Ligand SMILES: Nc1ncnc2c1ncn2[C@@H]1O[C@H](COP(=O)(O)OP(=O)(O)OP(=O)(O)O)[C@@H](O)[C@H]1O
Ligand SMILES: [Mg+2]
């Protein structure tokens with residue numbers, strides 16, 4: 001299914017703040033009824049991929065919450081129908097095997113192995129005696145951050161949905177693996193799934209069908225990657241002018257995005 005937002009604005013509501021902390025003063029923003037997002041416009045066709053990026057605390061996660069219906073659109077129109085699958089920035093793990101963590105209600109062999117392979121989990125499970133039957137405890141505390149993220153991504157991807165919301169799965173040190181995952185999973189396996197990827201990597205904007213850049217709760221840019229280069233030349237030149245920007249830490253990339261966005265308001 002597609003997704004459309006026409007001139008959407010959303011305000012800080014009581015309880016959204018405490019909800020926000022878990023997926024990653026409040027009551028003051030709530031009292032003055034400040035916008036967390038203002039005049040958001042996007043039109044994503046079925047099967048397209050939208051890359052969302054922006055400065056830190058620009059309202060990327062909230063945009064996702066708006067789609068989940070955890071945050072209401074006081075103004076504007078949000079159109080989309082169907083199941084949503086959400087992969088939060090916080091990578092969670094329930095007691096049980098790796099396999100059991102990925103599988104939802106129904107187990108289906110071809111689907112499962114396809115998701116495991118595309119999420120690059122084969123490289124992981126081959127290091128364990130019991131492979132994907134290996135038992136994990138709550139939080140999967142001895143895995144790497146990348147391993148928890150790939151498992152949690154595979155769980156969300158395995159889910160049969162019409163729209164996938166992937167909040168920042170590509171933010172860890174094992175960047176070459178992340179490059180493979182992005183290619184195999186987001187670009188190939190999910191090529192025909194409508195998907196929104198929150199990201200701080202330029203390769204992802206370059207490969208996206210549509211791009212939304214957020215800053216201070218507003219749309220700094222929305223369009224194609226071609227359009228970004230010609231319409232936001234200052235931003236583009238600074239960001240593409242890097243050698244291997246995508247291999248900086250998540251923190252440095254976000255820091256650069258923020259500084260650049262602040263600069264070119
Ligand atoms: N854990 C938190 N504690 C306090 N305030 C928060 C927290 N998370 C978000 N906010 C506030 O809510 C607003 C929207 O934040 P949101 O998480 O949607 O932005 P984001 O771009 O997803 O953040 P990040 O850069 O961390 O991914 C921001 O203005 C921020 O000030
Ligand atoms: Mg497509």
Ligand SMILES: [Mg+2]
Pocket residue numbers: 024060061089167168
């Ligand atoms: Mg976030």
